[PDB]
Amino acid sequence: SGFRKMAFPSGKVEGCMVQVTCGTTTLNGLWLDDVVYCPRHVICTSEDMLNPNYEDLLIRKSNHNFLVQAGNVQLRVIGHSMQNCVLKLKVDTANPKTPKYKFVRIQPGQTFSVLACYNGSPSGVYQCAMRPNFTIKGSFLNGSCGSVGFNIDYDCVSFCYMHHMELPTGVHAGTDLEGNFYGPFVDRQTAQAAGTDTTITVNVLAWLYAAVINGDRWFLNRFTTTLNDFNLVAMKYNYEPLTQDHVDILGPLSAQTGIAVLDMCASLKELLQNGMNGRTILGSALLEDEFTPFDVVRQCSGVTFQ
Amino acid sequence: SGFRKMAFPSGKVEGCMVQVTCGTTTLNGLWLDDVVYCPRHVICTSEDMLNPNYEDLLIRKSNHNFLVQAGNVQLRVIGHSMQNCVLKLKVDTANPKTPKYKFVRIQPGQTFSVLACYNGSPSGVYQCAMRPNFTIKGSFLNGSCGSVGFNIDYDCVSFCYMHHMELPTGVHAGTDLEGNFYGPFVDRQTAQAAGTDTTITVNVLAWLYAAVINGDRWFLNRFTTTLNDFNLVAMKYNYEPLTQDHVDILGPLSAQTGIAVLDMCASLKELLQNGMNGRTILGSALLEDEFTPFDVVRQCSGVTFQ
Ligand SMILES: *C(=N)[C@H](C[C@@H]1CCNC1=O)NC(=O)[C@@H]1[C@@H]2[C@H](CN1C(=O)[C@@H](NC(=O)NC1(CS(=O)(=O)C(C)(C)C)CCCCC1)C(C)(C)C)C2(C)C
Numbered sequence A, B: 001s002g003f004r005k006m007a008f009p010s011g012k013v014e015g016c017m018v019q020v021t022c023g024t025t026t027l028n029g030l031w032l033d034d035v036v037y038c039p040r041h042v043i044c045t046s047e048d049m050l051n052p053n054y055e056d057l058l059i060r061k062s063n064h065n066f067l068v069q070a071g072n073v074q075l076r077v078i079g080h081s082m083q084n085c086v087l088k089l090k091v092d093t094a095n096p097k098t099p100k101y102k103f104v105r106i107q108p109g110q111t112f113s114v115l116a117c118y119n120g121s122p123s124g125v126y127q128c129a130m131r132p133n134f135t136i137k138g139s140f141l142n143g144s145c146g147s148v149g150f151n152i153d154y155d156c157v158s159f160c161y162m163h164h165m166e167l168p169t170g171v172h173a174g175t176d177l178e179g180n181f182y183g184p185f186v187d188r189q190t191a192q193a194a195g196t197d198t199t200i201t202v203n204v205l206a207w208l209y210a211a212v213i214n215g216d217r218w219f220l221n222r223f224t225t226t227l228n229d230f231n232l233v234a235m236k237y238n239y240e241p242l243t244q245d246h247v248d249i250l251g252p253l254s255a256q257t258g259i260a261v262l263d264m265c266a267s268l269k270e271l272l273q274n275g276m277n278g279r280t281i282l283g284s285a286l287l288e289d290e291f292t293p294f295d296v297v298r299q300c301s302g303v304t305f306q
């Protein structure tokens, strides 16, 4: 029993983190086979950041302008190129600790673990979700750029996020590992604003199922509803609409608890309209939307990784 | 900016986890140098658990009754002994991945990371606190016994917890790595109950400081209070008393924010007496007590590990 915000084990990613220095700027890099991936803004000086021309800035650099350290060892940079908003640094040594990996571009609502790093060294691991407005609510300080987000799928590390910047509201924005931003952001210091955020409905329902599995049942009722009546109420409270795909995804949890998805929707509708009235669910006084249906299954059925 | 429930990176512990089988029972073990540590109840059968005599049960075993697997490799058991409630299995091979480590018995209020494991393989990592009643609010399923709790201090892994059992309220109890239980529990299947839990006051104050550091200031006020008036209110709400040692521990956070400890106590007093009135702090609608002053400093100043 119990239910915690659980991250993947980070060992396989820890051995891929390196430190990258260009000029006076140091941040983190991801070392896989013989390539080091890092945010391209590492080549910017203070003057460049309002409106950098990255092609110009990169053509002015040579291999020896990039200092790459893996612990004490220096890695010799033998080539460099730019893909979208990442820099790719070819080095003379292939990382002997390269895990089996893939690069994946995730969708809003999905969750992943972040390994926060400074100067190439892991500081901590935590779980977060890609919000509907393509920001993440992370925890990052100066020097954290290049820290990555990942999931583990059997024996394979799927990298889905590399950290680039913080917005004035305190939330975070970054790219996939091919350098494409999530969201409408660009890597220059101009005023940019995130869309309004919404609550990830399918995740809230998954977490209400986790609550039932753990014996928290006070919010259940005998009612049922339709997708159409549910979505009408949901849109009024800034909740994402529920689709049939969502209902099918919640299948295994409905089966294991014997509570139909649309029955659980009727409970959520009531919680939205009346609030929780100082009761808690799974130790929370707010409805929690950063667990996916798969996160719940994994943690309530005990899935491991190789 | 930002503030998350952040665990230590788990890589150094992942390479120490093994699977231990005795009879029909399989659980996890901790492999350091040439010794495998695991809960001694792995030697019990269903008949033994109401009232096991562990000295009897162990004298009836031989080295070949214990199957220890590190991945695919089998480890040959060459000796066994019992220390308090752990079993120590001497094996023919010293773990080549043994980190620098120490064993530490922690006190209530301290936090640590748990690496939850099944069949010797890491499932997930999360942070939790030792509660004042010596339970932890974990997330564990069948097969999780032998999973460990740890902190990292520079380059050194400090192991402080090994998982043994779940209580009927859904919370968890275990031992230090020398086999001594935290709390009044024993490893037999008799009715046992935890003391009443209290809220860890010094951690709540540390988290209110994190909130100020992150720009959440609505709860501050101009008042101040004394330790004695504060503790009188605190005891009425099942909060632990605040000592001078606590006040000094909060020093670096008071300095960094310029809000005196006893000023912050006056804010907490108000929050206890009036509640939060549907406002949130750091994304929570309840007062959070599983961050220590050191956790806050580490995450708001960016400390890393080697
Ligand atoms: C990577 N090492 C570092 C990580 C941040 C430090 C604090 N927490 C973070 O996550 N990121 C950067 O250095 C990043 C690089 C420059 C400046 N960067 C910022 O994150 C900064 N924010 C920022 O400029 N944000 C935008 C502009 S703004 O804040 O509205 C302003 C008022 C015009 C300054 C620009 C990006 C989109 C959102 C708004 C800051 C946190 C250091 C101030 C670059 C963006 C290239």
Ligand SMILES: *C(=N)[C@H](C[C@@H]1CCNC1=O)NC(=O)[C@@H]1[C@@H]2[C@H](CN1C(=O)[C@@H](NC(=O)NC1(CS(=O)(=O)C(C)(C)C)CCCCC1)C(C)(C)C)C2(C)C
Pocket (backbone or CB within 6 Å): A001, B027, B041, B044, B049, B140, B141, B142, B143, B144, B145, B146, B164, B165, B166, B167, B168, B172, B185, B186, B187, B188, B189, B190, B191, B192, B193
């Ligand atoms: C380790 N692999 C495993 C982990 C638990 C499985 C589910 N989640 C857990 O953390 N632990 C055990 O197998 C442990 C070993 C036997 C039985 N154990 C239990 O955890 C069980 N609880 C239990 O017996 N608890 C106490 C008794 S009771 O529950 O009040 C009862 C009504 C008399 C059965 C005994 C210990 C102190 C607290 C109360 C259970 C979760 C499997 C039912 C031993 C305790 C030796």
